[PDB]
Design a binder for this molecule. Structure first.
Ligand SMILES: CNc1cc(=O)[nH]c(=O)[nH]1
Length: 154
């Protein structure tokens, strides 16, 4: 019982682009760009589409970097999140009524204002590692348990 999602991190050598969601799921937190995958759409095309819809950026090359399954206790649907990374983009990040994008220096990533799981896997992403993860949450702030391992193939 899992639903596909995408998550894209525009990660350059000294900085990463994050977006502050204004409403809905995860509002008030800095996050990568993504959302649900459409019927008849590949996960990668879904990731490219969501990056444009949410950030206004056009991605050329996308690299798979991780897979993370999220469980929210009491919610039937598991989120199967396919994480991607890019250093090659076109355009300038667009602020919209839904999203406020901002570039962060790598030593200044706002972990306290991000989903709690990011403190676990962002260190791997920053060191160009690939990973498989699972996080069980109680509500939106508490991680009850988790698993996270590095992999050669996502
Ligand atoms: C539930 N955890 C996460 C959801 C999401 O959209 N992005 C994260 O980094 N983590």
């Amino acid at each position: 019982a899992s639903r596909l999602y995408t998550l894209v991190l525009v990660l350059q050598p000294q900085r990463v682009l994050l977006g502050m969601k204004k409403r809905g799921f995860g509002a008030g937190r800095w996050n990568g760009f993504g959302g649900k995958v459409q019927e008849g759409e590949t996960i990668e095309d879904g990731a490219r589409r969501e990056l444009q819809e949410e950030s206004g950026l056009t991605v050329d090359a996308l690299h798979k970097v991780g897979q993370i399954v999220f469980e929210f206790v009491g919610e039937p649907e598991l989120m199967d999140v396919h994480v991607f990374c890019t250093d090659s983009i076109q355009g300038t990040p667009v602020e919209s009524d839904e999203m406020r994008p901002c570039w962060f220096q790598l030593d200044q990533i706002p972990f306290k204002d991000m989903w709690p799981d990011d403190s676990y896997w962002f260190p791997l992403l920053l060191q160009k590692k690939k990973f498989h993860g699972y996080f069980k949450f109680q509500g939106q702030d508490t991680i009850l348990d988790y698993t996270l391992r590095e992999v050669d193939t996502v």
